[PDB]
Write an enzyme that holds these catalytic residues in place. Structure first.
Site, PDB file in Angstrom:
ATOM      1  N   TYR A 157       0.822  -1.204   0.000  1.00  0.00           N
ATOM      2  CA  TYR A 157       0.000   0.000   0.000  1.00  0.00           C
ATOM      3  C   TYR A 157       0.861   1.261   0.000  1.00  0.00           C
ATOM      4  O   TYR A 157       0.432   2.295  -0.526  1.00  0.00           O
ATOM      5  CB  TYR A 157      -0.948   0.015   1.206  1.00  0.00           C
ATOM      6  N   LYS A 164      -3.439   8.284   3.234  1.00  0.00           N
ATOM      7  CA  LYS A 164      -4.509   8.119   4.219  1.00  0.00           C
ATOM      8  C   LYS A 164      -4.135   8.750   5.554  1.00  0.00           C
ATOM      9  O   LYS A 164      -5.002   9.294   6.253  1.00  0.00           O
ATOM     10  CB  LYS A 164      -4.845   6.638   4.428  1.00  0.00           C
TER      11      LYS A 164
HETATM   12  N1  LIG Z   1     -10.269  -2.114   0.031  1.00  0.00           N
HETATM   13  C1  LIG Z   1     -10.689  -1.019  -0.513  1.00  0.00           C
HETATM   14  O1  LIG Z   1     -11.201  -0.980  -1.673  1.00  0.00           O
HETATM   15  C2  LIG Z   1     -10.709   0.204   0.346  1.00  0.00           C
HETATM   16  C3  LIG Z   1     -10.560   0.080   1.730  1.00  0.00           C
HETATM   17  C4  LIG Z   1     -10.748   1.188   2.546  1.00  0.00           C
HETATM   18  C5  LIG Z   1     -11.024   2.398   1.978  1.00  0.00           C
HETATM   19  N2  LIG Z   1     -11.126   2.510   0.637  1.00  0.00           N
HETATM   20  C6  LIG Z   1     -11.317   3.899  -0.009  1.00  0.00           C
HETATM   21  O2  LIG Z   1     -12.633   4.001  -0.484  1.00  0.00           O
HETATM   22  C7  LIG Z   1     -12.669   5.036  -1.502  1.00  0.00           C
HETATM   23  C8  LIG Z   1     -13.380   4.522  -2.739  1.00  0.00           C
HETATM   24  O3  LIG Z   1     -12.487   3.627  -3.422  1.00  0.00           O
HETATM   25  P1  LIG Z   1     -12.987   2.202  -3.969  1.00  0.00           P
HETATM   26  O4  LIG Z   1     -12.226   1.135  -3.269  1.00  0.00           O
HETATM   27  O5  LIG Z   1     -14.462   2.172  -3.922  1.00  0.00           O
HETATM   28  O6  LIG Z   1     -12.423   2.257  -5.460  1.00  0.00           O
HETATM   29  P2  LIG Z   1     -12.954   2.838  -6.848  1.00  0.00           P
HETATM   30  O7  LIG Z   1     -11.882   2.657  -7.836  1.00  0.00           O
HETATM   31  O8  LIG Z   1     -14.281   2.128  -7.179  1.00  0.00           O
HETATM   32  O9  LIG Z   1     -13.323   4.353  -6.485  1.00  0.00           O
HETATM   33  C9  LIG Z   1     -12.276   5.348  -6.519  1.00  0.00           C
HETATM   34  C10 LIG Z   1     -12.934   6.562  -7.123  1.00  0.00           C
HETATM   35  O10 LIG Z   1     -12.044   7.702  -7.098  1.00  0.00           O
HETATM   36  C11 LIG Z   1     -12.363   8.461  -8.244  1.00  0.00           C
HETATM   37  N3  LIG Z   1     -11.342   9.461  -8.519  1.00  0.00           N
HETATM   38  C12 LIG Z   1     -10.035   9.251  -8.882  1.00  0.00           C
HETATM   39  N4  LIG Z   1      -9.406  10.338  -9.263  1.00  0.00           N
HETATM   40  C13 LIG Z   1     -10.363  11.336  -9.140  1.00  0.00           C
HETATM   41  C14 LIG Z   1     -10.343  12.716  -9.422  1.00  0.00           C
HETATM   42  N5  LIG Z   1      -9.293  13.361  -9.939  1.00  0.00           N
HETATM   43  N6  LIG Z   1     -11.474  13.419  -9.197  1.00  0.00           N
HETATM   44  C15 LIG Z   1     -12.549  12.778  -8.731  1.00  0.00           C
HETATM   45  N7  LIG Z   1     -12.691  11.480  -8.441  1.00  0.00           N
HETATM   46  C16 LIG Z   1     -11.556  10.810  -8.670  1.00  0.00           C
HETATM   47  C17 LIG Z   1     -12.513   7.409  -9.337  1.00  0.00           C
HETATM   48  O11 LIG Z   1     -13.164   7.988 -10.464  1.00  0.00           O
HETATM   49  C18 LIG Z   1     -13.373   6.384  -8.593  1.00  0.00           C
HETATM   50  O12 LIG Z   1     -14.755   6.699  -8.717  1.00  0.00           O
HETATM   51  C19 LIG Z   1     -11.209   5.466  -1.711  1.00  0.00           C
HETATM   52  O13 LIG Z   1     -10.928   6.566  -0.837  1.00  0.00           O
HETATM   53  C20 LIG Z   1     -10.434   4.251  -1.198  1.00  0.00           C
HETATM   54  O14 LIG Z   1      -9.127   4.602  -0.767  1.00  0.00           O
HETATM   55  C21 LIG Z   1     -11.016   1.444  -0.177  1.00  0.00           C
END
Ligand SMILES: NC(=O)c1ccc[n+]([C@@H]2O[C@H](COP(=O)([O-])OP(=O)(O)OC[C@H]3O[C@@H](n4cnc5c(N)ncnc54)[C@H](O)[C@@H]3O)[C@@H](O)[C@H]2O)c1
Ligand SMILES: NC(=O)c1ccc[n+]([C@@H]2O[C@H](COP(=O)([O-])OP(=O)(O)OC[C@H]3O[C@@H](n4cnc5c(N)ncnc54)[C@H](O)[C@@H]3O)[C@@H](O)[C@H]2O)c1
Ligand SMILES: NC(=O)c1ccc[n+]([C@@H]2O[C@H](COP(=O)([O-])OP(=O)(O)OC[C@H]3O[C@@H](n4cnc5c(N)ncnc54)[C@H](O)[C@@H]3O)[C@@H](O)[C@H]2O)c1
Ligand SMILES: NC(=O)c1ccc[n+]([C@@H]2O[C@H](COP(=O)([O-])OP(=O)(O)OC[C@H]3O[C@@H](n4cnc5c(N)ncnc54)[C@H](O)[C@@H]3O)[C@@H](O)[C@H]2O)c1
Ligand SMILES: [K+]
Ligand SMILES: [K+]
Ligand SMILES: [K+]
Ligand SMILES: [K+]
Lengths: 268, 268, 268, 268
Positions: A157, A164
């Site tokens: 990561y 984060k």
């Molecule tokens: N295991 C995991 O998937 C996990 C765990 C904990 C937290 N998260 C967090 O949850 C959130 C959503 O991610 P996800 O896992 O659903 O993945 P995802 O790829 O489905 O969503 C990420 C989103 O960020 C958007 N994004 C990227 N660059 C951007 C920009 N310049 N302007 C606007 N939007 C932008 C993308 O278009 C996408 O919709 C993120 O913050 C991720 O770090 C994910």
């Protein structure tokens, strides 16, 4: 009447139907919320994806690195929800780190230009979305962002973990600003979720050793969690976000709520 | 024989005789260390300042935003300490945030270009200095950086606090890399120290309300600290850095040692 | 239909109408829960107090230091809720420390016999109530206890703070046991609430300096909280407990949820 | 001249030559300290064991549950070190939990009488030793206790973990009291050490599953530690205690220093 009946909530971060934000939006609509969605770059795809949500939701373009998108965002939301109305909630579900900052690529070899882009999108944008939308949020409203516990380092990561850590700090300052509007600001620290990007990484998109290490991390999570952890089921995460968007945690702000099966409370 | 007898230690971050790094360097020399110093921008001033240290120390130019300075740094250190010799310690005492990111300037109004510069200098550079110098550090060596506890938000410090949160995360990853060389990596979280910059801020250089808030923060620190806290005396901080550079905390890495009078362990 | 519609919830800890548990019970009934209450020592008083709740609730005697009360508790609950029914929730709102362990009485002068009684009532009993009632709790159920953030020492609270540190540790182990039943276990860390006991302490019941110090602690809490803190209003705390008793934080366990206005996220 | 040259230090907790306190005492004597030892119950054995230390050290009986031993302790120390002299350091290396509170015996089945004995010996006694000895400690002195990180629950350690959580809280209050004497109070959180008791547990003395779980915990520790972790070598722990007894961390109090290879800073 649902948990969020009549509430107007902006939801960012949908890109596929495995996005955490897709399930946040689905559950919020199941609970009576009226949504405004924001999408980045691939708006035709996002429109087609969100046609599958239980109710119609207007979609607005928002690249969080585009100062002009942010400068017009509030006016564009008002066009959609109607003059005299305000938002009750804001969901930040946005994260990105260039490949050099993750995976088997050595930690020391990520150029700062790449790290800075990832911190812009994943941390700074939590502040700049709050700056844009707080002037059109109701007292008692709620800002929620997505977190992945960065209190300890972990394989692969890499610089996303650093982003984060920055995001958690940003959230504590956004809470100070949001409190002047009667608005709460909190993060949900989720366990790992098999989004399309995460499935590809486990399949080796960022190198074999990185895929191996992330797979081992997922397995240990379900093992440690006293109630287990299902990385294929984002509904418990979506429900927790909706809990923070409701009025049922009215004295929580600047804080981090863990939706991770309890894994972070156990060592083994 | 002193605590650091014969050890070769690189010390960054001296700009005046009130710099924390000036006192780190003084105490290290009092304890037998042989120093190499690095300085940014005002090398004539830094040379004149460090003429006051108890022993001669060669001074090398290092702008941590300059990739060419970093790419030649190890070779330039070897020129000074001699072919076949290595460093035993590395002190990172470098921090900067543009004015827009601190003080009475609203948190939301700091442009990301400014925040990114501050995070580059204050957080990313801890990794890039480790990248440059680990190849010429001895097993059993020690990397130490300066921290200001960012676990809670506070007035005025604003985006510098966010940069420190990032730095703490970076330190945990640098420890992973440094361990391959038998090297430890740790931060010292200091209480507030009246450097020239901090005295100017309290005098109002960043706005009156920000000066007022930082003055109140300093006063509460000495009040909370069970052994008190003297912001005019950096020697306890310097001694703690030297403790981490010695072999007397040989199983501590990726960690944060608090040199703050105990203030962070008390609520009131 | 309320947040807790049809759920059967046991609520301990009511002694007056300013008890946090009185407001937990009131809000839970407002949200459709069917309650069983437990009371210590002064059962005539507690009955008269709880006559004021919106709905009738059977009252059972429970001294958590009485092994016989605990050994019969589950059977006595089943008598009340009916054979074949189980509890969906358990609220632990029980705390006590003898006067020697709080106030102006020196920290070192509390005899261990007194400290041990306070830890028995305030920490161990969270485990022994879970032991008694988990066999009659439904999958998806929820155990919630009341916490006061003990991560930093503070004036006057003294050994009660030590008891809360123990309680937080106990909660992480109770979560391991409860997970086998599909049950969550969490604490709510509340800001200060003006119960009858706390008003008396501020009035000087435990010495003047202790009253002065607790009054200053209350004032700083509202000052630090980004959304403020009203010690005369326990409803936000009650709502947060009800949130954890519902199904809306289904992946949170072994954890601590802060209902404190955000005060613990801010230094000044 | 050693790190602790001429300092008078009381060391509790020696029972065999694998005790952590035996190695604390050895290293302290190697660094010039003059020791007073305290022992529990088996004084003939402890005398024979400590005959192997590099220098002679007087041995005093101290059962920390015996109020009379504590009431005479300071006078008995003065008899040994001489009228007009004071202690510079105090090492608390004392821990006990009855078998019902550890191992495969169910967490819920430990009677409070047993838990209370373990908390008396492992946590409360840190305060009562400080109460006894602070009146004969020099300004600039140092109290150090042994900790095992209890921030997350783990298999088998059970109620000993709860006792360590209490101890960490006690340490923050002892720091408040000790500061009035110019004395620091800190804990060292050590990684697992193969003492005689721990080897027996891994051999199954507390049940097979508990031995299996503790063995897995030891293995993961060395795996996570960026500099590794050798459970057969307590010298790095002893050196860290001596660091805190010296004057080289003069602004650290109420705190916890990790001598664990960095393991607690890494998730995987
Ligand atoms: N295991 C995991 O998937 C996990 C765990 C904990 C937290 N998260 C967090 O949850 C959130 C959503 O991610 P996800 O896992 O659903 O993945 P995802 O790829 O489905 O969503 C990420 C989103 O960020 C958007 N994004 C990227 N660059 C951007 C920009 N310049 N302007 C606007 N939007 C932008 C993308 O278009 C996408 O919709 C993120 O913050 C991720 O770090 C994910
Ligand atoms: N109260 C305090 O002063 C306080 C408290 C805790 C920690 N710290 C930290 O201690 C460290 C030293 O700061 P200080 O308080 O002694 O102040 P200072 O102004 O004396 O030192 C800051 C140093 O950073 C250097 N620097 C800035 N930009 C640089 C660049 N591009 N390349 C290389 N060096 C660069 C400056 O030249 C200067 O030497 C910083 O990390 C600071 O955040 C300070
Ligand atoms: N500021 C605050 O009041 C504050 C802040 C945070 C958390 N809390 C916690 O909330 C909980 C409820 O306390 P409160 O403030 O409402 O005060 P309270 O005095 O109204 O309630 C304390 C309860 O504990 C019960 N109790 C004591 N000994 C008992 C025993 N042997 N067996 C069973 N019950 C016993 C009492 O009968 C009483 O009902 C406690 O855990 C307290 O520590 C209080
Ligand atoms: N892995 C580990 O061994 C480990 C890890 C971290 C911390 N620690 C801690 O280090 C400390 C020393 O333990 P150890 O591992 O060296 O084991 P040990 O068995 O060698 O030492 C424990 C000591 O406690 C003493 N003690 C017990 N009851 C006492 C009483 N009533 N009065 C006085 N002394 C009493 C025993 O006599 C013995 O000397 C303990 O606090 C332990 O929890 C141990
Ligand atoms: K599990
Ligand atoms: K003080
Ligand atoms: K406030
Ligand atoms: K390792």
């Amino acid at each position: 009447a649902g948990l969020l009946e009549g509430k107007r909530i902006l939801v960012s971060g949908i890109i596929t139907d495995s996005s955490i934000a897709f399930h946040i939006a689905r559950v919020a609509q199941e609970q009576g919320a009226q949504l405004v969605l924001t999408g980045f770059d691939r708006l035709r795809l996002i429109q087609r994806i969100t046609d599958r949500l239980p109710e119609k939701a207007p979609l607005l373009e928002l690249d969080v690195q585009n100062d002009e998108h942010l400068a017009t965002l509030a006016d564009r939301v008002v066009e959609v929800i109607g003059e005299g109305n305000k938002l009750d909630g804001l969901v930040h579900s946005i994260g990105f780190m260039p490949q050099s900052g993750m995976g088997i690529n050595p930690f020391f070899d990520a150029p700062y230009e790449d790290v800075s882009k990832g911190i812009h999108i994943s941390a700074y944008s939590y502040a700049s979305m709050a700056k844009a939308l707080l002037p059109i949020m109701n007292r008692g409203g709620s800002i929620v962002g997505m977190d992945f516990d960065p209190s300890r380092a972990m394989p692969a990561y890499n610089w996303m973990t650093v982003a984060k850590s920055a995001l958690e700090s940003v959230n504590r300052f956004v809470a100070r600003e949001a409190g002047k509007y009667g608005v709460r600001s909190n993060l949900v620290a989720a366990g790992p979720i098999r989004t399309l990007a995460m499935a590809a990484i486990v399949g080796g998109a960022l190198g074999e050793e990185a895929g191996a290490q992330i797979q081992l991390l997922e397995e240990g999570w379900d093992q440690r969690a006293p109630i287990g952890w299902n990385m294929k089921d984002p509904t418990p995460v979506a429900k927790t976000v909706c809990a923070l968007l409701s009025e049922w945690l009215p004295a929580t702000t600047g804080d981090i709520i863990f939706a991770d099966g309890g894994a972070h409370t156990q060592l083994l």
